[PDB]
Each structure stands twice: as structure tokens, then as C-alpha cells.
Write a protein that binds this ligand. Structure first.
Ligand SMILES: OC[C@H]1O[C@H](O[C@H]2[C@H](O)[C@@H](O)[C@@H](O)O[C@@H]2CO)[C@H](O)[C@@H](O)[C@@H]1O
Lengths: 439, 7
């Protein structure tokens, strides 16, 4: 109704190969007659849920998988229905990233991880550790250059260092991703954020460095190193910098742990072109020729399609992408990921600016992210409990609540508040419900 | 999040 029928509108981030994708759209148009329009609006990961909630937006949305769980929970994405033959063409782990509540909600395209990118002319052997970067910066500053510049405004770029000694922020429990009790607040994360803030205090980095500033400095030969994903490689090729792409530096002997995003393509639930979207994604884009057209414009990283990934396997930059991906953490796709990112973004900005100490910044981020994630799991458990009818199951839930004493009885009901329960009681209800055969 | 079960 609001979205035009008989054509496809695709949204993809401005840093990705939207011109290469438009070439795949011209191939679709040449074969089928259907026009494909590719757009890259600003802040599309936020603009998409705003317009799709009103039945508007693109037919197809491209973004890393982390945001798709939140879109699916709001009813914004159509369930995808590839057959076994198509599913067998992509790596099984890529399908896991786009599965939400038992259903596939997007087509996985590529596996993205940040790497350390360095200028071989300024730095033939890149540093293996973060600890050696302050003295390296001093040496390069005497020659008119800096050691490292990377986007400090987005938590995606600073998280690898924070999590190097901090470890993974999330864990899998009772059929769901849960943020750890100290996934953001631990001493290792505090050490990582302190190291980053100390780099700024010692004038080795600037708190206002953003994506454009870092990209221009590296591509103009002003800084020996940057941190970026595969999409950035084309702009460095154009600049003629002799670069290497390698493992991120270690911190306290621990590998840096980037969040691994699976660039994925979802179909808007309001689209009147769901079958055309499926044909374009399965038969045009997710082929060697389709992925090559996008890849030639801006590299995708380690693609989800087995056949084309084998043709990209010999690229040393992809081997580095995969090595960093293995050391990092696959992003969860739960709806609270939005709150997790807002909280870490705020902690890094406040620590780097002196608004808060490192300890206060991460303690507050842990509270904000864990409260939102826990609230979502409580809302879901409340929904789940309210549909149960079977006597044995209800008796056992009530038996578990009775052990705590956190309940009240009225003339007609047995009452309790999920918010007044301890997390161990909530975990026992979740564990019992997982065994009851009900969902 | 109050839950009510039939008594
Ligand atoms: O910084 C938080 C941000 O991180 C990720 O976004 C990445 C994205 O995955 C990459 O494809 C690339 O475009 O850079 C982005 C960071 O600027 C999460 O995917 C995103 O939801 C999150 O807000």
C-alpha cells in the first residue's frame, strides 16, 4: 500500500558497496523487467524501524544481524523461506545469526570483523600489543606522523580493546542470549577503557576523532595505523597507500575481541514484493557474480556463500578478517542490543571526556544494559506464564514461587510479581519452562 | 509485572 508494488527499494549503509549492489539490481531488471532502486539514507538502522512501523520503508533492509531481532520482535520483518538446497549454499553459522525465536528473519550476506590496518612504508612491522603504542607514537611524532587514529565515537570500534581483558559481554542460557552480570563492568573492561582514556590524556589520540577524520588521516599517510572493516579497503586502494591488514593488538596478553556482525538482508513485513525480494536475494545477489559486483565496489569481508568465499580465501586481508572474527564475539540479535550499544557509547564518550571516571562510566553502562535486557526477558516470561493452562505445569510454577514466599492470595487468584523475584528464582522458572515442552 | 493464576 505505502510501499510501491512492482519494483524493489533497497536500503544499505553508505560505507558499503551500494553502487555494486545497484549493478546487481540492473541485472535483475534486465532479466525480469523489475526496477531496483538502491538508497543509503543516514542512520538507516534507526530510520528503518521508524518508517516500517507505519507500513512504509524499503522492501529490503541491509544491516549487521544484531538489529534484526529488535525489528522482528516489533513485527517489521517478513519470515524468509529458503529451501534446504539454498540453505546448504551458505555456512550454517551465518544462518544461526539471522535466526530469531526459531525463525529465519534475514538472508546472511557477509561476516564482518575489524582488523588493524597499517601503512607498511611508515611501519614495516606493526605492533603486536597495545602497550607498545604510546612509545611508537612518540617515535612517529618526532617524524611528523602519529601511530594510530580510529573512530572513537562508535562503541563498535572501541569495544575490541575494552573486551580484550574483559572477555565476552554475553552468554547463552536457557535458549536465549543473556548479557553477563559483569559483561561490561568487570576489572578487565575497566583496564581496557582506562588504557584508551590514557592514550587520549597522553596526546596519543584525540577524543573527537571520528570515522571521516581517521579515514582521511590514514589514507593521506598521516597516521601509521587505523582500525576498520573490509568496506574501507577500496578507499585505501585508491589512495595508493601500501597497507597491511592484520590481527588487532593484544592488551594484557589477551587478544582484542571485536563484535562480529553478519551483514544481512531483511524483507520489510509491509512490502507487497516479498516474492520478488526473495528472488533478487537468492538468485541474483547470493551468487558468485552478485557478490563479486558488490565486493568489487566495497569488499564484503568473509562472505556467507561457500562458493564465492573459496574464491576470496587466498586474499591475505580476508585471512586477517577471519582471524579477528575468531578472536571476537558474535553479536547477539536480542532486542536489547539497541540499549547495549547506547550504554557503551555513552560510557566511552563520558570516560574520554572526563564527565565520568572509567569505573563509574562502565558501572552505569552495565546497569543500563542489564536492566533493559532483564526487563525484556521478564516481559516475555510474563507473556509465556499468562498463556499456560495445564494444571501440572501451573502447580510446579506455583511450587517454585512458594519456596521464596514472594506471593499473595486473593479470593480468586494466586498472585506474584516477576519484578519482586530474585534472578535465581526467575532462572529456575525459565529452566523448568524449557523442560515442560511448552513455549 | 504482576502475574495472576486462577486460585
Ligand atoms: O557502534 C555500535 C554499532 O555497531 C555495529 O555497527 C557497525 C556495523 O556492524 C558495520 O557494518 C559498520 O557499518 O559500522 C557500524 C559501526 O559504526 C552494530 O551493527 C550497530 O547496530 C551498532 O549500533
Amino acid at each position: 500500500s505505502k510501499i510501491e508494488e512492482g519494483k524493489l527499494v533497497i536500503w544499505i549503509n553508505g560505507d558499503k558497496g551500494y553502487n555494486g549492489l545497484a549493478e546487481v539490481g540492473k541485472k535483475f531488471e534486465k532479466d525480469t523487467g523489475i526496477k531496483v532502486t538502491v538508497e543509503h539514507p543516514d542512520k538507516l538502522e534507526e530510520k528503518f524501524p521508524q518508517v516500517a512501523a507505519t507500513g512504509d520503508g524499503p522492501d529490503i533492509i541491509f544491516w549487521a544481524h544484531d538489529r534484526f531481532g529488535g525489528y522482528a520482535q516489533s513485527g517489521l520483518l517478513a519470515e524468509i523461506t529458503p529451501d534446504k538446497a539454498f540453505q546448504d549454499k551458505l555456512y550454517p553459522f551465518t544462518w544461526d545469526a539471522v535466526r530469531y525465536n526459531g525463525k529465519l528473519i534475514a538472508y546472511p550476506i557477509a561476516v564482518e570483523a575489524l582488523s588493524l590496518i597499517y601503512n607498511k612504508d611508515l611501519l614495516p612491522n606493526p605492533p603486536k600489543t597495545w602497550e607498545e603504542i604510546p612509545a611508537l607514537d612518540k617515535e612517529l611524532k618526532a617524524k611528523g606522523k602519529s601511530a594510530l587514529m580510529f573512530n572513537l565515537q562508535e562503541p563498535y570500534f572501541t569495544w575490541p580493546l575494552i573486551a580484550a581483558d574483559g572477555g565476552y559481554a554475553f552468554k547463552y542460557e536457557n535458549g536465549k542470549y543473556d548479557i553477563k552480570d559483569v559483561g561490561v563492568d568487570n576489572a578487565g573492561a575497566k583496564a581496557g577503557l582506562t588504557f584508551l582514556v590514557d592514550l587520549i590524556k597522553n596526546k596519543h589520540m584525540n577524543a573527537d576523532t571520528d570515522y571521516s577524520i581517521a579515514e582521511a588521516a590514514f589514507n593521506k599517510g598521516e597516521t601509521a595505523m587505523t582500525i576498520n572493516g573490509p568496506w574501507a579497503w577500496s578507499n585505501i586502494d585508491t589512495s595508493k597507500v601500501n597497507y597491511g591488514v592484520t590481527v588487532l593488538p593484544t592488551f594484557k596478553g589477551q587478544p582484542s575481541k571485536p563484535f562480529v556482525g553478519v551483514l544481512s538482508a531483511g524483507i520489510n513485513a509491509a512490502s507487497p514484493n516479498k516474492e520478488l525480494a526473495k528472488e533478487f536475494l537468492e538468485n541474483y545477489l547470493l551468487t558468485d557474480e552478485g557478490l563479486e559486483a558488490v565486493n568489487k565496489d566495497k569488499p564484503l569481508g568473509a562472505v556467507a556463500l561457500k562458493s564465492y568465499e573459496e574464491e576470496l580465501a587466498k586474499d591475505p586481508r580476508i585471512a586477517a578478517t577471519m582471524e579477528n572474527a575468531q578472536k571476537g564475539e558474535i553479536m547477539p540479535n536480542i532486542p536489547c542490543m539497541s540499549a547495549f550499544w547506547y550504554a557503551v557509547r555513552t560510557a566511552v564518550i563520558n570516560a574520554a571526556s572526563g564527565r565520568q571516571t572509567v569505573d563509574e562510566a562502565l558501572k552505569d553502562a552495565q546497569t543500563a544494559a542489564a536492566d533493559k535486557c532483564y526487563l525484556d526477558e521478564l516481559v516475555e516470561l510474563h507473556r509465556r506464564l499468562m498463556t499456560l493452562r495445564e494444571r501440572h505445569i501451573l502447580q510446579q510454577i506455583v511450587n517454585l514461587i512458594e519456596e521464596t514466599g514472594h506471593f499473595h492470595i486473593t479470593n480468586t487468584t494466586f498472585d506474584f510479581d516477576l519484578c519482586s523475584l530474585d534472578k535465581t528464582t526467575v532462572r529456575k522458572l525459565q529452566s523448568y519452562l524449557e523442560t515442560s515442552g511448552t513455549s | 509485572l504482576p502475574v495472576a493464576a486462577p486460585l
